[PDB]
Structures are given as structure tokens and as C-alpha cells.
Amino acid sequence: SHMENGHLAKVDLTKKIESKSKYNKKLEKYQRRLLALQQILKEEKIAVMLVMEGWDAAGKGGAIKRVTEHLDPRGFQVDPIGAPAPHEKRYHYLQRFWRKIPQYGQITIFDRSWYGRVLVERVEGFATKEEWMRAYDEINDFEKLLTDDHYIIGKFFYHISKEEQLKRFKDREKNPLKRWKITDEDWRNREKWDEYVEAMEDMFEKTSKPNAKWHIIESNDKLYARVKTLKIIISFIEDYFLEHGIELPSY
Amino acid sequence: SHMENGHLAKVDLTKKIESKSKYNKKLEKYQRRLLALQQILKEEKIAVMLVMEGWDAAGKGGAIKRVTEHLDPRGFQVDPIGAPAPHEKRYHYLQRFWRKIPQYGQITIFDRSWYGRVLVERVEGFATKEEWMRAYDEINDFEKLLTDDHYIIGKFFYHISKEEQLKRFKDREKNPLKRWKITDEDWRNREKWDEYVEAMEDMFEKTSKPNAKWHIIESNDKLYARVKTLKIIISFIEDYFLEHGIELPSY
Amino acid sequence: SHMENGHLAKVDLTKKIESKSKYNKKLEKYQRRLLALQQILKEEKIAVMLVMEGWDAAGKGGAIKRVTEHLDPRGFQVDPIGAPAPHEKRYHYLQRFWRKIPQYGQITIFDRSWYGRVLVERVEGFATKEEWMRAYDEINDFEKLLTDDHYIIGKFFYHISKEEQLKRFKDREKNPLKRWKITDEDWRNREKWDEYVEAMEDMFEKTSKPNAKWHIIESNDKLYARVKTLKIIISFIEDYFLEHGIELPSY
Amino acid sequence: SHMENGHLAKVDLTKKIESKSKYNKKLEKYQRRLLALQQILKEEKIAVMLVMEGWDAAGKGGAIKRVTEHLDPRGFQVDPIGAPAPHEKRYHYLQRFWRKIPQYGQITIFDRSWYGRVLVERVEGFATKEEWMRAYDEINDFEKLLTDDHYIIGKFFYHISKEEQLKRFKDREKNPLKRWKITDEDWRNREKWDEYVEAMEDMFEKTSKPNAKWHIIESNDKLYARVKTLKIIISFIEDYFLEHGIELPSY
Secondary structure (H helix, E strand, C coil), X not given: CCCCCCCCCCCCCCCCCCCHHHHHHHHHHHHHHHHHHHHHHHHHCXXXXXXXXXXCCCCHHHHHHHHHCCCCHHHXXXXXXXXXXXXXXXXXXXXXXXXXXXXXXXXXXXXXXHXXXXXXXXXXXXXXXXXXXXXXXXXXXXXXXXXXCCEEEEEEEEECCHHHHHHHHHHHHHCHHHCCCCXXXXXXXXXXXHHHHHHHHHHHHHHCECCECEEEEECCCHHHHHXXXXXXXXXXXXXXXXXXXXXXXXX | CCXXXXXXXXXXXXXXXXXXXXXHHHHHHHHHHHHHHHHHHHHHCCEEEEEEEECCCCCHHHHHHHHHCCCCHHHEEEECCCCCCCCCCXXXXXXXXXXXXXXXXXXXXXXXXXXXXXXHHHHCCCCXXXXXXXXXXXHHHHHHHHHHCCEEEEEEEEECCHHHHHXXXXXXXXXXXXXXXXXXXXXXXXXXXXXXXXXXXXXXXXXXXXXXXXXXXXXXXHHHHHXXXXXXXXXXXXXXXXXXXXXXXXX | CCCCCCCCCXXXXXXXXXXXXXXXHHHHXXXXXXXXXXXXXXXXXXXXXXXXXXXXXXXXXXXXXXXXXXXXXXXXXXXXCCCCCCCCCCCCCCHHHHCCCCCCXXXXXXXXXXXXXXXXXXXXXXXXXXXXXXXXHHHHHHHHHHHHCCEEEEEEEEECCHHXXXXXXXXXXXXXXXXXXXXXXXXXXXHCHHHXXXXXXXXXXXXXXXXXXXXXXXXXXXXXXXXXXXXXXXXXXXHHHHHCCCCCCCC | CCCCCCCCCCCCXXXXXXXXXXXXXXXXXXXXXXXXXXXXXXXXXCEEEEEEEECCCCCHHHHHHHHHCCCCXXXXXXXXXXXXXXXXXCCCCCHHHHCCCCCCCCEEEECCCHXXXXXXXXXXXXXXXXXXXXXXXXXXXXXXXXXXXXXXXXXXXXXXCHXXXXXXXXXXXXXXXXXXXXXXXXXXXXXXXXXXXXXXXXHHHHHCECCECEEEEECCCHHHHHHHHHHHHHHHHHHHHHHCCCCCCCC
């Protein structure tokens, strides 16, 4: 099929970090670096937008936590994106995202995003064929608007196996503290798994751009995922500084 | 030159309505019609955006007043657009407009607009060459986003002669009630008149689209201007209703 | 009764301005003065809040129009207050007013106000006995907060006879342009007229304060009403300037 | 002195939890309970406001983290309060807090608060004598407004010794990840320590009310502090449910 040579099928899900302590050392290393870059970001009038998509339970929440753990909370916002509330449905679909875009020197992090227009909204049919079919180009224009200006955009997709999802779904059910986090909605979405793959493959084809790359994170192991998120970010910020003459902190 | 066969040079500035009373009758006729359409707008989940550009003193303020005089104030907002305030300069240039776009069933009216990016911002150099050169396509995308959805957009440009501007500038100075309304800024802008023409011609070429037409209103006579504004609006709303199956009120 | 020696019963409804032209001269005189004070307001970090209450059709809308006709629209906002929308009902009742209070140097004008908590909300029972009974002191605290700071507050009540209301209700029905403006709600409220009087008398007793006076405007004649509104405003602004050392423009 | 029999001098700073594991068990116990109450909160149209004040480094940040760790992020906001930004200084001092108050069913958490008007603003003289002297009663009115409605308010003050502060200040300096978190401002404020005590004692006297109690948390040991925060919250929520007939989850 096309799903046999698709992006998600080609992903090596064996990736991992075996030692918990060598994880902690790498995290703290990358956390230090990211904080140093946050100071240069604040001064230099550059805004960062991070988009995080993926399967339910795939560890977007976990990754964001590690990205922001030791950042200054005054310099970042985390925006968790669900279904449009009734007040948002009265405006064009992008209006609610435009209100959340960071000011210069600031980071906004999207737990889900506008990409819902071509995922959940497509598969559940909340958006018509015409709406989701034109939306890829709308989303690209939106990204380019900001990147042609002084925004940096990074997009991450956390990929896990269907079997790993089930293991995590079961653990969220057994733990009382995590029992919110798993709902009938979560199970419904796993049932549509293969429709989602089709939709996610189209998204990687249509909306992976030089100014706004999709990064597919192998996420069966949370440790690898979290550390690779930090690594990719640090890298695309440094690349941006080097390109535009800004001076890096200890590189 | 190109300004000899430009849009603004071809405009017939002699247009007028001689009788004040035949003006009042036409206004009230079109005002009644527009109110009737406002009820259909509210119910039907359609949003209208009006953009008004033009020379200082050209009568945008006057036109808006006649458009909204007998409308329900709960169903429209008038947004007067000046230079970005310090808080707006911290975000991408379109963010402040996205916050002002109408909800469905509502009208927003822009006294100036995003088009400032390719007019004042160009001539005074607040926007670089790259910024204003790419902005025409950005503005077009923005308009099409909304028109591909459920927004109707109408753009009006109020054109007067340089001599008529001077007459109005002088009257605003003599009348104490109108003395705000004329500033050093106004005089500065008249000095750059021919740069503005060049910039306005480019705008009419680049951003006049089937879904979002520029309408050049002959405005040496305020009466004609005001009545032609109402006429054009009524028309493009009715056209939208006819196209999308909605039923008109007494047409 | 108490309504025989009430505030509204004592009001002389014969007040009028006989000559339309002597009205126009007085209006323009007071409009010039108010604009001059608006410049001193902007510079001096003082905010003005105007509250307008009254019967339906009593001319609040008309008065506001004359107050703002020749003011700079960048220095004032007019906020028309209806029943709380669903999104506002999720917060405490004053939260929606706190969002509308003017910044320093600016004027906000309330077409209705928080006073709805002790009028419509009382008579229609949208607010319990406890809620509206404690609300007078809450509203007083709110006013004093702002007046103890750098806000000036003026409150106006437009009083007309029951017979004058009916005449205006009939005219709004016959004129197509004014037919919005009269609804079943308007008729329902006239039926509760005497409950409203009781509620309005309590409000004048409980919430008329030195820092925030109620001004009962005789409004059977729109002309007198409009001109007396401007006169009272000009006066309480000038008084504020004199009290706090600010220098007036041509007094 | 008065500071010898003051609230903060009477506090027993020896309080602690010796075992890290018996801490983890208690935290998870109270975290489970709080989540269960969060579901009843959402359904029942009750809003919670938590205020957290205290010395720099006293563990407000730590406490909030434990309070919210296993809560649904869609049902709470954490608002970190610094000095007013230029845009906030254009409005009355409480306006920025009114924008942050939770909707019904939601929790807002203030890392600092309006109480800055009678602490930092007093000692550094950003607020005049008249301003901070009247502010205690203003703050009380504000709290009572919300408590007379359907808001629950809990206020926490995290108290540590001057010597413990120094130890933490030194640790924040040595750790690169925590080096933001300690600034010249932090050192300046420790120099004014005794002025702060005077100001905090006045605040506990003037603004500790039955509907809005101050809870002085012994915080030399972070573990005790965090667990006592959860305990107090769970308790004042349960008390509110019992008082108003709502049924508790497993009590």
C-alpha cells in the first residue's frame, strides 16, 4: 500500500535510551543550553512557536514538560488545544490561533494545533471535504507569514505503535491520578487509527516545509522522545541565530 | 506616464447629486434596504467586512456614518485604524486585524486597514522593501481565507482631487469642532501625494480580486459618495444571498 | 404614597427649549467646550465614566450621540449594555464591567450599566433578593474605588412621562428605520412601569453619592435633555480640574 | 516590640516531614482527593481562587507545582504576578486582577496577587501612603464580592527564616538551571526584610477574614509546606460543599 512506504511505517520505533541516569545527564545538558538561548531570544526580538501533534498517550504532554521544566515561565506560554468552544465557532477557524501567537522574544507551545483541521476535523467530518482539502495551503501560508517575519516554527509528531498505545491506555486507567487523560473519546480515536494514518501521511507530504519542518519523533520510549525534542529545538534555534548574525552563548 | 492611464486619473470626479432632498430620499431608501439585509445577515451566519481607504478628508468618516446611521449597533463594530501602538508592534502585523474580524452574523467596518502596510508603511518606510513587496500576496491570502469561508468583503477607496482636499483641509482648520481631524501629519501626507498615487495604483492592480473587489468612489461630492457606498454594499450582499440560496427581503 | 414624594414624581417634566436654532447654538457652544476639555483629559491622566439609565425611548441614545458627535473617537468608547451573554454569565456580574472601564485619559460611556443589577435584574427576578439587596453597596464600593483613584464618574437618568413613552413607542413602530429599537421586551417593560419606579427610587436613595451623583434629566423634550447633559458634564469635569490644580482652557 | 508577638515570630519553623517516602505517600493521597473534588467543582458552578504570598525562595512555586501536578490543566490557570507592565498602569490597579478571576467551575492560582499593593508597593513607595492605607479595605471588599457570590478564596503565606532564605539564595546561584530565579531584585528585597515584616503583620491583621482566611505555612521544609497546602485546600473545599448541600466523593 502507500501506508507500507509511508513516513510512519518507515520510522524505527526501537530507538531508546537504556540508562535512566544517562538520560538525566543529557536532559540537564540540553535544558541548560535551551535556557541560555531563551535569554538571547528575549533580547533579540525573535518568537518561537512549537507545535506538538501525535497519537493520544504518545508523550506530547511529557515532552512539553521537559522542554519547559527549567525555562522562565514569563517567557513562554503553553496552549492546550481541544475542540473549538462555542464562542470560537463564531469566527473563522484560524482566529483562535492568531490570538495565541507569541509576541517577539516569547515562546508559545501548542499541545495540539491548527493541524486538527486536517486530522480530527477531517476524520470525524467536522470539516467538509472542501474545507480540509484547501486547509493544507492555508496552514502553509499561515506558517510562512510568521517565518517570513521574525517567527521560528518547529513542529513535532510523536509516533508510537498501536500496541504501545494500548499499554499506556491501560496504565492511565489503573492509576487514579491519570484516570482523567483517558476517555471514551480516546478509545473512539484509536478505533479510527488507520484513517488517522492516511490523514497524517497527507499532512507530512503537504505541510513539511523548509521554514517549518515536521519532525517525526520515535516515542515508544518517553526518554528518547524527550531528549530528541530538546536536541532538535536547540539545533533549529542555533541555526536561526547563525543565519541572522546573532551570537550564540557557549557553542 | 503610468499615472496618466492609472485608475485614479481615469476617475470622473464630476459625479454629483445636485439636489439635497433627492439625496435624502435615496439615502433613506438604501438605509431601509440595508437594515432589512442586516436581519438576514444576523440569522444566516454570514459576516461582512468593509474596508475604507482614501485620501485624508476624502469622506470615509462621512460614508461610514451614513452606512451605520440606522443600523443596529449590536450587529456592527467600527474599528478606526491608526499607526500600530507599542503593544501591537510586539506581534506580526496582521495579528491586530485578526482580533478585529467580525463574528458570523456581524459587520466590522475598518476606517483604515491592513492596506496601510502597502501605503503609509511603504511611503514613510516603516516597512522595508521586502515587507511591502510580499505584503500584497499576504493581504490577498488573508482576504481569500475569509471569503472561502463565510465572510463577505467589500473595499472602498474615496478619491478626491488635490484641490478639493485643500478646500476641506482649510474648512477643518476654520471650524473649531473639526480642528482635531487636521494635523501636521495630514499636511505631511499631502506633500507625498504623488508617492501615494504610485502606491495606490500598485494596490488596485495587485489586490483587486473577484471575491474582494476594490471600488473607487468618486468623492469630490460627499453626497454622491455616501449614496454610492450604500448602493454597492446592498448589491454585493444581495449577490451573495442569490448565489448561496438565501432569500432576500423585498427585491 | 412614597411614590408621590419620590424623586421622579417631583421632577418638572415641562422643561424645554422652544427654539430649534437656540438649541443648535447652545449645543455647539457646549460641544466646543467639551472638546477643549477632552485635550486636557488626554494629557492629564484622568479617566471619565458616564452612566446613562432611563426608560426605554427616553433619549439616552440621543444624548450620547450629542455628547460624542464632535469628540475624537480615539479618546472615547461607547459600550451598549444588554442582558449578559452566555460567556459573561460564567463570571461574577461585575467582571464584564471591569473589562470596559476606561484607561487614563479616556472616556467610556455606558448606555446601560451595572445598575441593571438593581433594576431589570430585580424586577424580572434574574437576581435573588439577597443579590440585589447587597448590590447597592457593591456598586457604591465599585464607584468609590475608581473615584478614590483618578476616575471621574457621572450618572444620568433620563425621565419621561408614561404618555410620552407611548408617543415615542408609536413613532418607532411607524418609522421603518426605527422599527428595530422597539420590541416585545420594550412593551413588557412598560407594563412593569410602577415596579421600575420603586426600584429606581431605591437606587437614587442608596447610590447617589458626592463622588458619583445621580443627575435626573427632564427628558420629555429631547432638546433640553441633550443640552443639559453636556452642561452637567462640562461642569463636573471643570470642578475636578479646579479641585486638583489642573488649568482650564478658556473659563 | 510588636514584631516579637507578631504572627510570623510566633510561627514554629521546626515543622517538617522527616521521611521522603512518607511525604510521597501523603502527597499522592491528597492529590487523589483534590482531583476528585475538581470534578465536583467543574459540575457545580463554583470557582476557586488561591493566593500565594511569601518571601522569595519560600517555596510558593514548589507548592503550586504540587497542587496542580495531577490536576486537569483545562480546569485551572496559574497566573504569575509581577510588577505592572506599562499597559496595565493605564488602568486602576485591580483591573488586571479582574481579568484573571476564574470562571465558575475553574481554579485560578495567583503566584503573587493584589496583596502587592500593601507589600512591595508600600515598602518601595510605588503606592502613596493614602493608596496603601485604603487598600486593605478595597482588597477586603474585592474578596467579599466574590465570596458573597460563588467563589471560594484561599490565601497562603509561605514563611521561612532569614537564614533559610540565604541558603536557598546560594543554591539558586550555584545551580545553572535555577540561576534565573535569583536577581539583584531578590537581594534588594532581603535587605528590606524588616519593613516587609511590618507590612505583612499589618496585612494579616487587616485582611484575614472568615470568608478569606490567611494561612501561614511553615516552609523551612518544602515537604511539610507542600503537603499542608493540599490539606488546607481539600479542607476548605469540603467545608464549602458541606455548607451548601453538595455531596462529597469519598469522605
